[PDB]
Amino acid sequence: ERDGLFCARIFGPVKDYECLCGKYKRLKHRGVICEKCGVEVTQTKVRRER
Amino acid sequence: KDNLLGEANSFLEVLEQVSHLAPLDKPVLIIGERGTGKELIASRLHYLSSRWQGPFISLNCAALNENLLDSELFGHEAGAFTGAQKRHPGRFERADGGTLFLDELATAPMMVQEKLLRVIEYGELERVGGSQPLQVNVRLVCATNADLPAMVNEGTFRADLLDRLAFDVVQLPPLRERESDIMLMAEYFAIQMCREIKLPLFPGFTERARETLLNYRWPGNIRELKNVVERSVYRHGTSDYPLDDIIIDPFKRRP
Amino acid sequence: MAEYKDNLLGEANSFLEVLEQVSHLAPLDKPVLIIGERGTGKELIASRLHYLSSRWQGPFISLNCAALNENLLDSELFGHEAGAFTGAQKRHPGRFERADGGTLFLDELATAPMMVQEKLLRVIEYGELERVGGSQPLQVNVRLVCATNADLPAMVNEGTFRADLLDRLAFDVVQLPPLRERESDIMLMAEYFAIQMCREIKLPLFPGFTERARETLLNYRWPGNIRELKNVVERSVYRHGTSDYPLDDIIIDPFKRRP
Amino acid sequence: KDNLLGEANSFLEVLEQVSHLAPLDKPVLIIGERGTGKELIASRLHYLSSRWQGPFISLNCAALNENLLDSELFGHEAGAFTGAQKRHPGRFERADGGTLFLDELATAPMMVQEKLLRVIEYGELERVGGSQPLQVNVRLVCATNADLPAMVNEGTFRADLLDRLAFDVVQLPPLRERESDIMLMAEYFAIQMCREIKLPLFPGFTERARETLLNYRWPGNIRELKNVVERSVYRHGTSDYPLDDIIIDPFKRRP
Amino acid sequence: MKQGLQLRLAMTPQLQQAIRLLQLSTLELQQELQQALESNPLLELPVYQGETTQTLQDYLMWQVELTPFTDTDRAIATSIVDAVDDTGYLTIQIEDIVDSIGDDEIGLEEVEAVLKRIQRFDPVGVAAKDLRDCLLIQLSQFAKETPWLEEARLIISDHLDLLANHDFRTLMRVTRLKEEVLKEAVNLIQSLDPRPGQSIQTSEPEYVIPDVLVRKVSGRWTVELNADSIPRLKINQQYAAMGNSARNDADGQFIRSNLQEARWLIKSLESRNDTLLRVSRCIVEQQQAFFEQGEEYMKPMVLADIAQAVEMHESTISRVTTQKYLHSPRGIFELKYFFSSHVNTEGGGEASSTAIRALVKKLIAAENPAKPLSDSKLTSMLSEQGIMVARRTVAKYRESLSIPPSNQRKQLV
Amino acid sequence: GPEEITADIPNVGEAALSKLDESGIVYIGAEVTGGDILVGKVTPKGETQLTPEEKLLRAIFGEKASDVKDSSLRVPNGVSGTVIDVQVFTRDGVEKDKRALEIEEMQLKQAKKDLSEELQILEAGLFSRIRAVLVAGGVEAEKLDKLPRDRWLELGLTDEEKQNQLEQLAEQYDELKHEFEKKLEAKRRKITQGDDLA
Amino acid sequence: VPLDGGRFATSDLNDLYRRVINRNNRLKRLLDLAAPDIIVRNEKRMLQEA
DNA sequence: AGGGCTGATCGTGCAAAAGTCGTGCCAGCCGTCT
DNA sequence: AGACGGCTGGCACGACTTTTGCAATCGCAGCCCT
């Protein structure tokens, strides 16, 4: 959901390192922030930790 | 269910026939004296018809324009002519299931007779340049002062027009023909008219003039009696005036 | 294939042979001309032919010369493509253009417009049709069928019917018998009509046709072959009757006013 | 060029005169018997005219409508009226050099006569509110079953209507008249009828019935003979039927 | 009067925008309404549950972490695994992951080594990456003692193109081997860890919100508007009652303008819903044959005449007809999907290009797998139906269906 | 798409199908060791596009298409042993009866053998009544024993009392045959009435 | 906590604080519109409660 | 004492140009059998 | 072993769909200019 509950660019990372939109879809990508949605493409522990 | 019918033997038989034929959606014919209001019985039957909850729209045959007869029996599809929009159902298509009492049916011309013969069939309504005709079933009703057999013998009406009729041609007896409860019905009509015109009643009343006019022609079998009664009431302009010197002769010049 | 006629309102004496001859001519698509009583035995014959009509999916488009007004008749006949004649809009599919390959079911309306007849003469001349304001004529195909009610030669001698109209038409003649002549399936048709009336009106049983009723029907001139009998039977059923009298004092003729 | 012409002295002379005037594009009248196929011979001669490879569009004189006389004889400029776009040349303008074969001219009205007289002028195609008329030259041909002199004596044909045709009137002989290729045309018609009726041939053949019908008026000089031949072939119902018990009488109630 | 007749307004801006929003979709209109309501002042158990690779993604990473790997090796394995499509193959190769990282330390060689170590871990052939080497890895992991293993390996190595057409005889001729000699090998190659997890790898769930649901209540399918998916426009009556008493003319005028705009928008939305319902009823009536029989019984159904005969015209209804869906026994059908092609006529013809595709699929199925049937046969069937397809006018239909026939693809028997 | 038991489990071991009967279910009485799969229902799965990679997969292996999720019934853990029998109930409108027709056939066989036995006794009583009515009147039991023959078809042991008794017993036997046929028909309808699931 | 899978059946996780946040955004739009002080106070009664 | 002019309020269609399919139809080719 | 052939895909054009881009003129009258 766009800006909904557990929304992208919010509440931590995504399920996979792939972004919800799809931009910067790689676990290797660390500092690359998808322009479509600014969310962490990393391990999902931050999802609880955000 | 409001006509001031005498409910006499002839009136009761006619009402029974109308009620029996009310459920039937087949076309019916009305004979008798026009101007008397056989159309009121037709409206009563249409209300009592099976299509009681149906849009019933009667039509005067003489009302339709000759060059607009097509637009009268149908609707311009607007795919033609200078007229736009249109696409409006004809009066029959406007009713489309109710009662269309044919008024001035005897006034229908040979072209009108042929158009009616075309309408003797069921539905199949094609508009101006229509892709396909539309079938719509509606109950039919016709009234005519003149004798349909007489017109057919004269050839004024088309043969199929007579063949268009299916139910019994209900013939209306004249004023002198029944003359059983006409006194009571006329008295009731006069009372209602007096109440409507804020006239209480006629203290003079009496029926010697009424008994004499019972032996009167009354060409307007029902309407003429009421009109003459209203004329007498207005001209007398008094209640305590018995049925004396009162005759059905409004056009007559006094001496 | 074989399509049964919805009704078989025919005469046992020779309308059976007439139907046989019609089936014999059923395969052909040429001008088929029927004749008989107007309003009675005519469009019933048309429906029987349409059942016996060759092939299928044929637009049995029926037109009556009474309709289409006077000025608007030509536009609906020949069609209309150019503007100002059909209000522009789409190329108006004319009445003739409506049925392409279908039966041109004619009604014995006898259009007083000799202009209508002259238009129809070109209608079946080489199988072509040009829309109103149409820059190009269009060759069209369709079947033809008609029913008649008056002496076309009598009108042609009287000039009421154009000689060219009958010359282009009248390839073969099929006259339906008058009602006063057949007198054969009269009992059969009467019984069929009585049964149909009892079925439709939910009558408990057919009251039955008394010998007096049959004698009156035989004596009845019945100007209409297939409808006047139908209308008389309808009027008699409308008059109704108890189970006691089968047809005593049955009002077949509704034109007769009551006492 | 598909008509099975009798090639009789009359028919051959007619074909020869048609070819002789085929190169000429002047107005002419094809007189004689209509219903007999003047249209087919007209198409054959149009294929045989000077402009054989041309758009030829014929029509019935009284086919159109009275109020649409301008819209038929010309094209709607669409500058006025509810008409839109349009600017479509008429059928005569659609030919634009072709043969405007006049058919059913006997049914033309007085307004039609005036329009034809306007057509007697060289081209001059002026629409409704058009800028200037356009002169367009096309071949002209006429065919009718009635005597235009008779109409002009009756006054029905206008003087210009009589003068509309620019050549001597060529008459088509009747069936009771030509009566020359009657056997040959009869045999060709019988062959065609058998082929259409899926009958290989008539084993009875013969022309005794054909010879008897030769001594008949046959008013539909070609139409009546063909219709009667087809009717007899269909009525026989068996190929082995000689030219006996076969006649032209569709209307008569058979004994 | 006579055969003559006669001919007989103008608006813009606000109503134009209101009508424009009606032309949009269901979820798009919901989002637009949500955004509009955000400015309108007068309008009215940590982490759920799952499993290792529940959506086909974490089993591979768990297996990799269950094995000794360095931080860079683990990162390369995670780049391979997380960038694995729903088909189980690595959706993004090593190059894509390196580019997204932009790190030279995680090079192509390191990523390739990590993938090879995790080539067959749990399950075999994970992060397969356009799986052609993954099939070979599955075959090699399968015991080489299997019969015709050399033949299967030779087929999988570079004979993939020959077997793509399924021309076994031509493939054997190319390989210079007897036909069906590697039939056991061919069968084993068919049974060779397709997409590893394949269906398990295919965690592709199902999502659908048809704008309507065709219950087909007692036939003549009852089209019921998705009222739950249909928002209800609520106007804040509290702002209405708190604005009338406002003595400040500016606030009252603003509230009145907001109320008028909300009324116009609610009218536009209600009109869109009503027109959609009417058009859906008409389409259901027209294509009950398509709803019950299927795509073969497809006739054109774009709204016309009836919509004009009812009210206004099809104009702006063609505009609002966009993006309307229905859930039916046939399945989910769109508004444009309801309208079909015309064969018997120029418009509304009995057959359709969708019907053409359905008949083509049926005919190609009604043939041996070696060679599909001629389109001329389906063409004759359409001609019987009245379309008169012919073999050439069928090429477009076959291309739309994309069924590979013998000339397109020749399979050996 | 419903999960239909046809043993058509996508990517199923041959031995797994080797136990399931063609009805998806297995044969009866069969013993299961470990987590054996008995009834393989084919729950439909979602579809996809052309997917030329999956197009090539279908061209190679095929028959799976990821369209039928396996709803197969496999034995529970720590559960293995003899299957004494099974029961299958199908809702009204579904009557595959792959083995349900066989089960209903066995059941109706027992039911009819029941109905026949009573009907057999009734018919035997009528036949013996006829034989006795014809007995002791020149219609020897050997004539009746050789062929029922309606006890030589009213041979005339009395020819009036025997004849009238024969007529009455013939009417009774016709009525009894009609009644037994009707009872068998009603029982067959009840057995064929099937199940009705949710 | 989706028991049937078809419905999430948010085990007390569906935050009306999301609806409260939507109401707060509406309050912010109204403040941009400078809504009446009564609306502002009532807006707090709901948004400030979150 | 007489002119100017002031902006309120003024709503369910359609059409006009474009697109765009449907159907058909050409061109080549490869499977092949010659 | 090159041509039949059906495929197939490009190529083509009318017929059906569409969508977007279009609202002044008040008529109050009072105030302000003349």
mmCIF file of C-alpha atoms in Angstrom, chain E residues 223 271-285 303 306-307 310:
data_model
loop_
_atom_site.group_PDB
_atom_site.id
_atom_site.type_symbol
_atom_site.label_atom_id
_atom_site.label_comp_id
_atom_site.label_asym_id
_atom_site.label_seq_id
_atom_site.Cartn_x
_atom_site.Cartn_y
_atom_site.Cartn_z
ATOM 1 C CA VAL E 223 -24.452 -8.103 -12.734
ATOM 2 C CA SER E 271 -23.668 8.838 -12.725
ATOM 3 C CA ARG E 272 -20.518 6.870 -13.563
ATOM 4 C CA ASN E 273 -21.663 3.993 -11.354
ATOM 5 C CA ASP E 274 -25.182 4.032 -12.820
ATOM 6 C CA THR E 275 -23.939 4.159 -16.419
ATOM 7 C CA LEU E 276 -21.495 1.341 -15.675
ATOM 8 C CA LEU E 277 -24.352 -0.717 -14.222
ATOM 9 C CA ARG E 278 -26.604 -0.093 -17.234
ATOM 10 C CA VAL E 279 -23.832 -0.877 -19.724
ATOM 11 C CA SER E 280 -22.921 -4.010 -17.753
ATOM 12 C CA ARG E 281 -26.531 -5.200 -17.866
ATOM 13 C CA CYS E 282 -26.588 -4.603 -21.627
ATOM 14 C CA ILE E 283 -23.274 -6.424 -22.131
ATOM 15 C CA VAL E 284 -24.449 -9.352 -19.997
ATOM 16 C CA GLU E 285 -27.596 -9.581 -22.111
ATOM 17 C CA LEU E 303 -22.580 -0.110 -25.794
ATOM 18 C CA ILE E 306 -29.507 1.276 -26.231
ATOM 19 C CA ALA E 307 -27.354 3.701 -24.253
ATOM 20 C CA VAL E 310 -31.992 5.485 -22.832
#
